[PDB]
Amino acid sequence: ENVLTQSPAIMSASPGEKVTMACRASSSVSSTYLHWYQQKSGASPKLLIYSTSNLASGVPARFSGSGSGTSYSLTISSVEAEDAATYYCQQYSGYPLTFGAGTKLELKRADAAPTVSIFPPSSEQLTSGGASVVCFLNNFYPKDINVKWKIDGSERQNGVLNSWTDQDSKDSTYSMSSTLTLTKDEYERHNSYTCEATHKTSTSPIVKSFNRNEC
Amino acid sequence: DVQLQQSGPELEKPGASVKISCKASGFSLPGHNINWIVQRNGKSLEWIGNIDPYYGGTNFNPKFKGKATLTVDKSSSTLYMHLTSLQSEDSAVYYCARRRDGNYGFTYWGQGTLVTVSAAKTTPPSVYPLAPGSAAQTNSMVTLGCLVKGYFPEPVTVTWNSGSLSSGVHTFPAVLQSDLYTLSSSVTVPSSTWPSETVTCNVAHPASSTKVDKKI
Numbered sequence: 175e176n177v178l179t180q181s182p183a184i185m186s187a188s189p190g191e192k193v194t195m196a197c198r199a200s201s202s203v204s205s206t207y208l209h210w211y212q213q214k215s216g217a218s219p220k221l222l223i224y225s226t227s228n229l230a231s232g233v234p235a236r237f238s239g240s241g242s243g244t245s246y247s248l249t250i251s252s253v254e255a256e257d258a259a260t261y262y263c264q265q266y267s268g269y270p271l272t273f274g275a276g277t278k279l280e281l282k283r284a285d286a287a288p289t290v291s292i293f294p295p296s297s298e299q300l301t302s303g304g305a306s307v308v309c310f311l312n313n314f315y316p317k318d319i320n321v322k323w324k325i326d327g328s329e330r331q332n333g334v335l336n337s338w339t340d341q342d343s344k345d346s347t348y349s350m351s352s353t354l355t356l357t358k359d360e361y362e363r364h365n366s367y368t369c370e371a372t373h374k375t376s377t378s379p380i381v382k383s384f385n386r387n388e389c
Numbered sequence: 390d391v392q393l394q395q396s397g398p399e400l401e402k403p404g405a406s407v408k409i410s411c412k413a414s415g416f417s418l419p420g421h422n423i424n425w426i427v428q429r430n431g432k433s434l435e436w437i438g439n440i441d442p443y444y445g446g447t448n449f450n451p452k453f454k455g456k457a458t459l460t461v462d463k464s465s466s467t468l469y470m471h472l473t474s475l476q477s478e479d480s481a482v483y484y485c486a487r488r489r490d491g492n493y494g495f496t497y498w499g500q501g502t503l504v505t506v507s508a509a510k511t512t513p514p515s516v517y518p519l520a521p522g523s524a525a526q527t528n529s530m531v532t533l534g535c536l537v538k539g540y541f542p543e544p545v546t547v548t549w550n551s552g553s554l555s556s557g558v559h560t561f562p563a564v565l566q567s568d569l570y571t572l573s574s575s576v577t578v579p580s581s582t583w584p585s586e587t588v589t590c591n592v593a594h595p596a597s598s599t600k601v602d603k604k605i
């Protein structure tokens with residue numbers, strides 16, 4: 175078989191940075207046809223680079239490929255927030271066609287502090303069962319936080335959900351949301367609930383509260 | 390136009406045969422191979438074999454033999470794949486792909502054919518609207534929430550106002566929370582485009598016949 179490993183597993187950058195990775199192949203990719211695919215967060219891979227060096231229509235020129243038989247480059251000379259993705263390559267063996275485990279890039283930028291905002295848990299939720307107090311922390315860098323809750327006081331419940339997002343293609347942001355899940359036969363019983371967020375941008379954890387106002 | 394048309398997702402129990410398809414539609418069929426590439430759950434890509442849109446060529450992976458019947462029917466042009474003994478790690482997505490050139494690595498790939506393989510009962514979502522408080526906040530531009538309680542399997546598709554207000558879209562993933570996968574999705578609308586113009590949320594879930602369009 176002809177198998178490809180292209181470390182760095184994860185890799186870093188800044189807008190400007192000359193970044194580089196390598197499709198390390200085995201012996202001769204038998205005449206060498208090398209293809210570099212960018213897969214952006216659950217999507218179709220897209221050809222940039224293809225008969226080893228060649229790029230096509232559709233791509234700006236942040237991108238030269240090259241090499242002979244055993245190593246292949248992709249010069250991403252300068253990165254914009256949407257170079258945030260996974261980049262894998264493919265070849266010959268002289269049939270069957272292997273692919274590779276691809277390289278992830280995570281665009282860096284100057285930090286921002288989180289915008290928590292709370293929504294009390296819906297008409298059709300309660301009339302029919304229970305309450306997902308969901309709190310969205312939107313548009314931050316560096317992705318790391320600790321989101322806890324103030325059930326009453328700052329009660330340490332369990333049964334709490336989480337979801338982070340993709341790295342955004344415009345602002346190299348990440349965002350995420352939390353949900354406390356509980357019976358009407360506890361939500362209509364405990365009074366003052368807060369999503370507490372901790373992050374290196376503020377000295378405080380930020381605490382946006384609610385106590386039985388709004389329906 | 391051109392397209393590689395694929396239709397998924399099917400959820401099967403462990404054992405069953407997901408009869409999948411792709412319609413190559415548009416270029417010459419005679420000199421072409423629809424390779425069915427497979428993408429791993431949280432992992433990497435790899436390849437099955439390919440099928441000639443005209444005669445019955447099958448060039449095949451020395452592993453993917455037995456879970457792989459790739460087939461074109463003459464009439465109308467269509468490429469098939471039929472995997473059997475569906476076992477818990479075939480639980481990934483599938484592709485169809487195309488030649489303009491000797492770029493031996495495809496430009497024109499298809500859609501997301503997804504397959505989930507597990508013996509748990511289906512659930513329609515329970516799509517819900519969240520209101521915040523009648524207030525003043527942060528900076529003068531408002532955030533509205535829609536969430537979708539546990540459903541089964543993933544996917545579902547949450548959408549907002551379809552065109553007019555594709556505002557600050559960020560759709561949050563799901564956990565398998567017990568069974569049921571769970572969603573939430575966001576916006577930030579200009580405080581004049583809302584309330585005078587109702588903002589809409591919309592959801593679909595194929596394996597539960599669903600459409601829920603919800604207004605805030």
Ligand SMILES: O=C(O)[C@@H]1C[C@]2(C(=O)O)C=C[C@@H](O)[C@@H](C2)O1
Binds near residue numbers: 422424487490491
């Ligand atoms: O160029 C293409 O995109 C594809 C891939 C393919 C192969 O055998 O790998 C190469 C040439 C063509 O015969 C077919 C099959 O279309």
